Design a protein around this ligand. Structure first.
Ligand SMILES: Nc1ncnc2c1ncn2[C@@H]1O[C@H](COP(=O)(O)OP(=O)(O)OP(O)(O)=S)[C@@H](O)[C@H]1O
Ligand SMILES: Nc1ncnc2c1ncn2[C@@H]1O[C@H](COP(=O)(O)OP(=O)(O)OP(O)(O)=S)[C@@H](O)[C@H]1O
Ligand SMILES: Nc1ncnc2c1ncn2[C@@H]1O[C@H](COP(=O)(O)OP(=O)(O)O)[C@@H](O)[C@H]1O
Ligand SMILES: [Mg+2]
Ligand SMILES: [Mg+2]
Ligand SMILES: [Mg+2]
Ligand SMILES: [Zn+2]
Ligand SMILES: [Zn+2]
Lengths: 699, 84, 97, 637, 364, 66
């Protein structure tokens, strides 16, 4: 009819499906084909997700071009119609599925045995129908023709479980990289990361990559795709698909046996036989450098389904590649104009800008780079100088910041009590010593780094607050900055300007690594394992030698003792050092880079993977280093007793200083990638402790 | 519509003062200011509400008093008041 | 200008000073008013009017009210050796009216 | 086919033939699109299909057709759009979306406000100026849906229309979403082949400058389409040109049965973001070739720094080095972003402290009036939430959302802070981050963000004793934290010292300024005030066309050209000078008003870069470093 | 009076005085509307001249097509167009504006234990936008009835406004008039030729205040003002004068302030801490109906182009202090809140009075 | 509106009406004009029918062409 007219499009799904089937069995990356081995792993219940890489498809098409045959542009068709090609690829995979070599047993998943029973039921239905029709023997009469016709009549007569109900895998499209597109003169919109402002309505239905920071992640919930009902009257299982935010259930049976009969059966839901998906809704926010001048950053919804859940956490700079799809309109009915649709990005691939330390694996690629960095020589000094190559000097400051990034070994004792392994570092000094720049650099280096202001972050912005999640429809506790920097370095600039509630929160966090909140909302204890780096000024804004160091440091004795290292950063005017500082800063301003060409600074990703490898080690301490540490602690306590009355006092020596020495020695042993702690590590830790305060204050 | 509350001098010790809704017809409007003690005679009848009360779970009715008369339990001077 | 939470309508209340126009306003515990009531009282005895600019309503209301106030001395006991100015929390402009 | 429609199409075709500017504007748009398409084919941006139309030229051509568009646009605008589409397709024969129209020029009685809009202006083309308060999400609206039938392997489609796209109303025929075709086969939706057009609605209320000071303001809803979405943000001053339309039936149906009335909204054809004083819209202006030639001629002069500085505020005597500092701040310097994500400041902060009635607030008001994106702030009036940002709750989405404060809205601009000494401590701690790290970090309940706040700051302070005392040390006179003084690039102490000759000069200057008459004004006539609204594209009185001193509108052209065009680079001849001056200043013995830190070297670099931007020079020279050092030495001593 | 409205006044013209709380936005009603049948293509016109009803459509589109009953065509081409087959052709329809007002009784005469009562009013055509909220008006109108969906047969009353008379007219920039009659111009020029104009204008300033002749001269100079400037460089120099009067109490300073407030074309009398509920300087609050920023009030913005008489200038808040400073020299107020940033004109002459500490002025 | 669209036709009923009036006034077949005497006979109630001859109109047009 002319009510639904037709158009001619360049796309033809038959030859594209044939190309997909040829690609899945022909592509060999340079045991046999790659995706055939992947499907063999899936069929053996060893893999749950199939990731289709568009780089492989582009390589396949280009090789087919080199042999000279004609192959359609499957990559661009996937880039423009990813929602259809998901099901096309799933059907192509289901067409040629290798048989499982492993036999099913009692240790397999419930879904696996359910799908196996469904497959066996399908074969038994086909066999029973073929046997029945062959036993009827209608014509009593070309064996191949009659076998083919019997196969078709059995296939279209029976009611089988559809392939959607027998799939144990999730299929995702990995975007093609920019490098492989650069090699072969390809211009891909999937490779280029877009901000949430630049994703317009003409990008709908496409596989696109969005770059941004994750702000909120929903809890993983079972979102049903098809509901299974059972009927006691006929024994059929009735499956109802669901593709909306809400559904209505079936009441009367819709199977053929009940539909033909006068008495209809009643359906009952079976939760185990129905099909669910792990569902998360995430909010991605525009990055600060992507927002135009004077604008507010925008947000985009991401739908995470299947095995990609729990791969997104708040505060993560991330590239999320997914299909831009429309949604039903949510809002006031009076304000809608036409067929307005909301937008979401059904996530297919997740790329982390800063790889997490817990996700580190000793693969073949990281091993050669770590070994190269080891054999380059002097890894400790080279890693220290490369934290902030822009900032001249402050070698010991950068060394202790690198130890802050690495951290010591946490201790768990069998009685249940714990001793923290994270180092806490304070940087107090006169203005103009670039401590804020160092804090920002440490935030950039660490995978989980939160930069806060002493008055910018309040009490509710540090600990927690109860809020309602509408997608899961439940009240959840949204954490603050200390929660957001869990198992990471939290940097607090302007530490001296904080109010007493934030001081109390940090006072509990630096020792206990927990926050205990007992308010009208919730009575809970939450884990905050932040390693805390603070920046601070004295009383008057400037250091004066007239007062004692304890006098001009506004810091109580307990929270002073919680800091493992405090760095006085005094701006002493000297003619010789100002020459070097001026030429360094001016070279940085002129050639837009570090002046020293005698060594190559380590890249932040290289530093991140080396620190990740160093954090895996758990060094122990022998008897000799224990005696050395004990004697050093005794001498430190005696020196603090002697200097307590004098004006050179920096506090009182504390068992926390003993723990700080042990922690710094363990971090230095970790940086050597060693399972043992030597004497020289303890000497370096004690040297750092001494040059933290006494060396610079004495001068 | 006038809310009539029990006067606190007559309430039993531990108990709360009860209240009723009094409906005033054409000539009885604006004759009793709030905060004053009145004595109202009227028909004690049953108000009708749709689908009763769902919160109680019982067929509970509300009651009103349609006022037939109101008696109260003024800076106007006459000529005798003037000469006084 | 106040909004009823249930009736969902706005009401302009003149307060005790406007409401007592051509009458008398009886203020108990005159010493311990807050700043807003003190400004209202000063405006009522100064111009015999109260000006409001709230919720789109900008107007003036007549407050020709005689005021009888009751107050306690500072410290709860009057001092005969000290004059009345230092025996109350009231300032000179509100006391001279 | 309609006869009057064809006649109006022919009339607008004749109008477009008479004025060749619209024709070759269409041609320029088409060749730009074709060049971008060819560049994408061989190795990007696309221009929208709409043309700005001057209503004055149309009134000169055909008064009847002009009055037809203004009074009854539903019968006259679609023929004009059809004629424009036919002309564009006629020039596109050698190399698909229909062309639109945008209107500019004087509207007369149709230049209204949201308060002035009544229902006599319904179904008319109106220009409404106001301030954007609410900006809804840009949502895609489905126009054509494409579906695939796998049994037959055929692609079907359906077109959808509503009342907000077309000016003249038609019969509403609701075509449902096709999920099965005529023969009953399953249809699968082909996303990526369906057509979605971006749709937005904004709420424009009257500007508080001409809103009545007592009562509530009035607002209207404006519907914007694919080429007009994201042209505005809340807080912008706008002029929206569009048809004031009414939609639906005002409860006259039996199903509807309420008194909302007929819903009224503007089908926006044109959105102009206008620049007002202390708003979020940056003042931009068209640079002609004559102006660029004049700027280049002034760039070659050797006294240009002394000409632009003295021509800033000629009504204020003295304070010449303050004028130089303000000019170098308006130049803005150059910021550095390294490969490791580090950011280095480019902007220059100026603090002036001293005696009252020393032309401090007048200088602040001048910089507010003459800068592109200057925003005025006072001390105790603004707070921590009003300066950086605040958090509110969206009504539609139900989630928290951000309000950008004074310092965020002045990104790449100037923040003019008056009465700096009376600010609260929380404000000081908040602005410690903004003056140096150039960002605002928000860590609230559920929201952790970082907003760019790249600004220049002018502050005016007052000594705690009321008047500056010479014999007292400056630390007690200023009474400000050392960190705050380190943040500011230049600090100027102004003293109202009395001298007979100097006071005679001040009095003569003030009286000569007070003997001024505007051109075209009588002796007794009072000067009228017109509120300054400018469109954002993309003691001698007779200073006109660079005679001795640069006039203010040309000075803004010079500043804008120097900001966008030239980005100077450092060279070793200036480097030796700035290193010598900085290392000398760190080791000087004389007492200075401002303390000396490592930031002073960067102030020297920024001032040298700004002076190079004054000279329109690709590089920083030795004389630039000398000027930068000698300007800072006055502020220090 | 509003409390005396009975059921005997229903559908009768009544005159009632009161104050106005809120004026609603202008709704769009249809006077002439052209309609077209959906499939029948029958064109009809409806002209409506009764716009005074609320909560109910007294005139609506017809429930069925009118082509069949008319039998207009001799051809007459069972066919049923359906229920409600007419659509409104908006480009050929005529509309007007309609406004809802809310009128309360005078708050001066209200019982102490009672919430004051109000009525809803409907006005249309040239009666809309004639009043601002807060003004005291006399409304002539029809006391009438609407049913809003507490009594089995109960109705909500309202007022059909037929005419509005304002008892007093507030003074502002938009309410100011600049047209002058010719006889007033002749009188004003004839007054100016008097050589003893300074003496008559100083004597006319507060004739009931004995002495303080120089202060009266100051008041005259305050009332005239100076010449405002717009200089070529963009900076402006003010012409308004600021006069402070500080001294011992009981010296007619407040009476001079009140006389200046009464004699000025636009003036606001306020204290240092503002009014009872009217703030000082400029107050930006959210709209009560749309939660959006707008300028609520303040003495210096309500009296732009006029005089603010600030009694008790010494007791004052710090934000008020800095805003008053910016209003005295720059004659503008700069408000930079979280959502709105603006600089708005505050061109006002400031006349302030203060009292010295320790009671009387001390010569030492 | 577009429900009753318009078309341009070569016929113009204003100049044709003017030509009809001029033909009725100034046509002299060869006492005075023919149709003016016919109208006088109609006005005197001596005639009940007016017969318009197209031959007269064609004659009038060809004289106007001459
Ligand atoms: N040793 C250094 N090397 C390089 N740049 C430096 C050095 N010391 C200071 N700077 C620069 O001086 C400026 C000081 O900025 P900040 O990092 O804010 O210093 P600061 O110590 O944080 O001052 P505060 O915030 O008052 S404690 C920055 O531009 C730094 O890059
Ligand atoms: N010279 C005068 N001529 C006439 N009336 C006067 C004179 N001096 C004072 N009064 C009256 O004395 C009373 C005192 O009130 P005001 O003097 O106006 O108050 P004020 O003292 O000026 O202001 P303060 O200091 O805030 S109480 C008023 O009724 C004045 O009218
Ligand atoms: N050097 C000067 N040249 C010209 N006018 C001046 C000068 N100094 C002060 N003024 C005048 O003094 C008045 C007071 O304002 P301003 O000086 O800006 O106050 P502040 O110095 O407290 O900011 C201004 O109107 C200004 O015209
Ligand atoms: Mg800092
Ligand atoms: Mg000033
Ligand atoms: Mg007084
Ligand atoms: Zn069944
Ligand atoms: Zn019909």
């Amino acid at each position: 009819s002319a009510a639904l007219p037709s158009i001619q499009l360049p796309v033809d799904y038959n030859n594209l499906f044939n190309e997909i089937t040829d690609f899945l069995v022909t592509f060999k990356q340079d045991k046999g084909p790659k995706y055939m081995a992947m499907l063999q792993k899936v069929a053996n219940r060893e893999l749950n997700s199939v990731i289709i890489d568009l780089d492989d498809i582009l390589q396949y098409q280009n090789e087919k071009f080199l042999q000279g045959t004609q192959a359609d542009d499957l990559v661009s068709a996937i880039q423009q119609n990813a929602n259809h090609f998901t099901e096309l690829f799933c059907r192509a995979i289901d067409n040629n599925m290798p048989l499982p070599t492993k036999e099913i047993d009692y240790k397999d998943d419930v879904l696996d045995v359910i799908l196996n029973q469904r497959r066996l039921r399908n074969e038994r239905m086909l066999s029973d129908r073929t046997n029945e029709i062959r036993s009827e023997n209608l014509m009593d009469t070309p064996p191949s023709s009659m076998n083919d016709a019997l196969r078709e009549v059995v296939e279209d007569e029976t009611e089988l479980f559809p392939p959607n109900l027998t799939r144990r895998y999730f299929l995702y499209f990995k975007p093609l990289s920019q490098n492989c597109a650069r090699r072969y003169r390809k211009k891909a919109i999937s490779s280029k990361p877009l901000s949430v402002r630049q994703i317009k309505g003409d990008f709908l239905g496409q596989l696109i990559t969005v770059r941004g920071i994750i702000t909120r992640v929903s809890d993983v919930k079972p979102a049903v795709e098809v509901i299974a009902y059972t009927c006691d009257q006929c024994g059929y299982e009735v499956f109802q698909e669901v593709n909306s935010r809400t559904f209505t259930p079936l009441s009367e049976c819709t199977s053929e046996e009940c539909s033909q009969n006068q008495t209809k059966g009643q359906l009952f839901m079976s939760t185990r036989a129905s099909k669910f998906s792990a569902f998360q809704e995430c909010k991605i926010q525009e990055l600060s450098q992507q927002v135009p001048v004077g604008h507010i950053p925008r947000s985009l919804n991401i739908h995470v389904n299947g095995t990609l859940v729990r791969s997104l956490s708040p505060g993560d700079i991330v590239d999320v590649t997914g299909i831009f799809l429309p949604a039903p309109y949510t809002g006031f009915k009076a304000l809608k104009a036409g067929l307005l649709t909301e937008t979401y990005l059904e996530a297919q691939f997740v790329r982390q800008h800063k790889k997490k330390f817990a996700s580190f694996s000793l693969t073949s690629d990281v091993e050669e780079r770590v070994m190269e960095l080891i054999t380059s020589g002097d890894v400790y000094n080279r890693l220290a100088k490369s934290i902030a190559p822009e900032i001249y000097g402050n070698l010991d400051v950068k060394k202790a910041l690198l130890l802050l990034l690495v951290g010591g070994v946490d201790k768990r004792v069998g009685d249940g009590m714990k001793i923290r392994g994270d180092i806490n570092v304070c940087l107090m000094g006169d203005p103009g010593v670039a401590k804020s720049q160092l804090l920002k650099a440490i935030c950039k280096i660490s995978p989980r780094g939160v930069y806060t202001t002493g008055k910018g972050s309040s009490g509710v912005g540090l600990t927690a607050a109860v809020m309602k999640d509408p997608v899961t429809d439940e009240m959840i506790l949204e954490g603050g900055a200390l929660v957001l920097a869990d198992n990471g370095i939290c940097c607090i600039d302007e530490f001296d300007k904080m109010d007493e509630s934030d001081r109390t929160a940090i006072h509990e966090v630096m020792e206990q690594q927990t926050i205990s909140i007992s308010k009208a909302g919730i009575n809970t204890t939450l884990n905050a394992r932040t390693s805390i780096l603070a920046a601070a000024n004295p009383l008057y804004g400037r250091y004066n030698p007239r007062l004692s160091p304890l006098d001009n440091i506004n810091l109580p004795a307990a929270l002073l003792s919680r800091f493992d290292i405090l760095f006085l950063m005094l701006d002493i005017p000297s003619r010789d050092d100002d020459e070097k500082l001026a030429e360094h800063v001016t070279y940085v301003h002129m050639h837009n880079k570090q002046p020293d060409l005698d060594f190559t600074p380590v890249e932040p990703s290289k530093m991140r993977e080396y620190i990740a490898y160093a954090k895996t080690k758990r060094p122990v301490m022998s008897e000799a280093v224990n005696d050395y540490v004990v004697q050093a602690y005794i001498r430190l306590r005696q020196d603090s007793k002697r200097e307590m009355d004098s004006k050179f006092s920096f506090g009182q020596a504390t068992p926390r200083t003993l723990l700080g020495i042990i922690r710094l020695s363990q971090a230095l042993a970790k940086l050597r990638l060693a399972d043992m702690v030597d004497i020289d590590d303890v000497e370096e830790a004690l040297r750092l402790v001494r040059v933290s305060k006494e060396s610079l204050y004495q001068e | 519509r006038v809310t009539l509350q029990e006067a606190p001098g007559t309430v039993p010790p531990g108990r709360l003062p009860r209240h009723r809704e009094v409906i005033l017809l054409a000539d009885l409007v604006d004759v009793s200011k709030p905060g004053e003690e009145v004595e109202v005679t009227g028909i004690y009848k049953n108000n009708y509400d749709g689908n009763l009360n769902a919160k109680n779970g019982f067929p509970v009715f509300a009651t009103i008093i349609e006022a037939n008369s109101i008696k109260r339990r003024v800076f106007s001077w006459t000529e005798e008041e003037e000469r006084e | 200008v106040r909004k009823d939470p249930i009736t969902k309508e706005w009401t302009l209340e003149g307060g005790a000073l406007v409401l007592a126009d051509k009458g008398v306003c009886l203020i108990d515990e005159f010493d311990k008013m807050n700043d807003q009531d003190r400004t209202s009282i000063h405006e009522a005895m100064e111009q015999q009017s109260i000006s409001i600019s709230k919720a789109g309503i900008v107007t003036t209301l007549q407050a020709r009210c005689s005021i009888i106030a009751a107050a306690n001395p500072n410290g709860g006991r009057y001092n005969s050796t000290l004059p009345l100015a230092q025996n109350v929390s009231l300032t000179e402009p509100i006391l001279s009216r | 086919p309609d006869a009057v429609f064809g006649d109006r199409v022919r009339r607008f075709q004749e109008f477009l033939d008479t004025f060749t500017s619209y024709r070759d504007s269409v041609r320029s748009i088409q060749v730009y699109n074709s060049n971008n398409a060819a560049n994408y084919n061989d190795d990007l941006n696309i221009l929208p299909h709409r043309i700005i139309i001057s209503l004055d030229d149309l009134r000169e051509f055909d008064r009847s057709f002009w009055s037809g568009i203004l009074v009854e646009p539903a019968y006259f605008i679609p023929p004009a759009e059809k004629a424009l589409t036919d002309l564009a397709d006629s020039m596109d024969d050698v190399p698909r979306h229909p062309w639109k129209l945008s209107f500019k020029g004087s509207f007369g009685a149709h230049a209204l406000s949201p308060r002035t809009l009544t229902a006599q202006h319904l179904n008319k083309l109106v220009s409404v100026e106001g301030i954007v308060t609410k900006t809804s999400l840009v949502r895609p609206k489905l126009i054509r849906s494409v579906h695939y039938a796998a049994k037959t392997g055929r692609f079907h489609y359906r077109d959808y229309t509503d009342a907000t796209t077309t000016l003249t109303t038609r019969i509403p025929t609701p075509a449902i979403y096709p999920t099965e075709d005529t023969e009953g086969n399953k249809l699968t939706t082909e996303y990526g082949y369906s057509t979605f057009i971006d749709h937005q609605r904004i709420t424009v209320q009257e500007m508080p400058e001409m809103a009545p000071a007592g009562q509530l303001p009035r607002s209207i809803d404006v519907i914007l389409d694919d080429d007009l979405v994201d042209k505005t943000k809340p807080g912008d001053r706008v002029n929206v040109v569009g048809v004031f339309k009414s939609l639906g039936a005002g409860g006259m149906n039996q199903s509807n049965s309420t008194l909302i009335g007929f819903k009224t909204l503007i089908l926006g054809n044109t959105v102009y973001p206008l620049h007002a004083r202390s708003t979020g819209v940056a003042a931009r202006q068209m640079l002609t070739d004559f102006d660029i030639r004049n700027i280049n001629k002034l760039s070659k002069k050797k006294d240009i720094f002394d000409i632009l500085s003295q021509s800033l505020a000629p009504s204020i005597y003295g304070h010449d080095h303050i004028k130089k500092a303000i000019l170098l701040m308006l130049m803005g310097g150059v910021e550095k972003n390294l490969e490791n994500g580090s950011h280095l400041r480019g902007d220059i902060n100026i603090l002036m402290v001293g005696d009252p009635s020393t032309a401090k607030s007048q200088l602040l008001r001048f910089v507010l009036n003459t800068a592109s994106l200057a925003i005025a702030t006072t001390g105790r009036g603004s707070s921590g939430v009003g300066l950086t940002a605040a958090v509110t709750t969206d009504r539609e989405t139900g989630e928290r959302r951000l309000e950008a404060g004074a310092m965020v809205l002045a990104d790449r601009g100037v923040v003019c802070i008056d009465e700096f000494d009376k600010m609260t401590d929380v404000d000081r701690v908040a602005i410690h981050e903004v003056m140096e790290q150039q960002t605002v970090t928000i860590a609230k309940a559920g929201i952790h963000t970082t907003l760019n706040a790249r600004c220049s700051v002018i502050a005016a302070a007052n000594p705690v004793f009321g008047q500056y005392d010479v014999n007292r040390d400056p630390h007690q006179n200023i009474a400000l934290p050392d960190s705050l003084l380190s943040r500011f690039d230049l600090l100027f102490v102004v003293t109202d010292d009395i001298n007979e000759i100097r006071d005679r000069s001040i009095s003569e200057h003030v009286l000569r300024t007070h003997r001024y008459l505007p051109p075209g004004y009588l002796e007794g006539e009072p000067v009228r005030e017109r509120l300054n609204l400018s469109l954002a594209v993309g003691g001698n009185y007779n200073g006109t066309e660079i005679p001795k001193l640069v006039t203010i509108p040309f000075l803004r052209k010079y500043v804008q050209y120097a900001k966008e065009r030239v980005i100077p680079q450092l060279t070793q001849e200036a480097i030796n000078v700035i290193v010598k001056n900085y290392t000398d200043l760190r080791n000087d013995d004389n007492t200075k008003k401002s303390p000396i830190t490592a930031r002073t070297l960067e102030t020297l670099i920024r001032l040298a870069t700004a002076h190079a931007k004054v000279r329109l020079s690709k590089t920083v020279n030795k004389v630039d470093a000398k000027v930068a050092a000698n300007l800072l030495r006055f502020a220090l001593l | 009076p509003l409390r005396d409205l009975d059921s005997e006044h229903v559908s009768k013209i009544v005159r009632l005085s009161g104050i106005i709380i809120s004026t609603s936005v202008l709704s769009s009603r249809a006077t002439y509307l052209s309609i077209m049948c959906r499939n029948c293509r029958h064109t009809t016109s409806i002209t409506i001249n009764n716009f005074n009803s609320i909560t109910g459509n007294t005139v609506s589109l017809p429930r069925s097509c009118l082509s069949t009953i008319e039998s207009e065509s001799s051809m007459a081409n069972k066919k049923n167009c359906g229920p409600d087959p007419y659509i409104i052709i908006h480009e050929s329809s005529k509309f007007i504006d309609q406004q809802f007002l809310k009128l309360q009784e005078i708050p001066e005469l209200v019982p102490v234990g009672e919430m004051p009562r109000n009525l809803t009013m409907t006005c249309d055509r040239y009666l809309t936008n004639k009043v601002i909220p807060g003004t005291r008006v006399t409304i002539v109108g029809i006391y009438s009835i609407y049913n809003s969906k507490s009594g089995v047969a109960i109705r909500t009353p309202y007022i059909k406004i037929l005419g509005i008379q304002s008892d007093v007219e507030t003074s502002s920039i938009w309410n100011s008039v600049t047209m002058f009659t010719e006889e007033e111009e002749e009188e004003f020029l004839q007054l100016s030729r008097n050589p003893k104009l300074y003496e008559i204008l100083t004597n006319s300033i507060a004739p009931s205040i004995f002495g303080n002749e120089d202060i009266k001269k100051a008041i005259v100079c305050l009332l005239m003002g100076g010449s405002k400037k717009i200089l070529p460089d963009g900076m402006r120099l003010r012409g308004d004068i600021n006069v402070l009067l500080l001294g011992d109490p009981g010296t007619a300073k407040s009476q001079l302030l009140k006389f200046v407030e009464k004699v000025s074309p636009i003036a606001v009398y306020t204290s240092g801490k503002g009014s009872s509920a009217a703030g000082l300087t400029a107050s930006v609050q959210r709209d009560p109906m749309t939660r959006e920023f707008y300028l609520e009030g303040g003495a210096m913005v309500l009296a732009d182009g006029g005089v603010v008489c600030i009694d008790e200038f010494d007791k004052m808040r710090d934000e008020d202090r800095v805003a008053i400073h910016e209003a005295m020299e720059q004659q503008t107020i700069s408000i930079a809140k979280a959502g709105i940033t603006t600089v708005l004109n505050s061109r006002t002459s400031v006349l302030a009075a203060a009292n010295p500490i320790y009671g009387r002025y001390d010569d030492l």
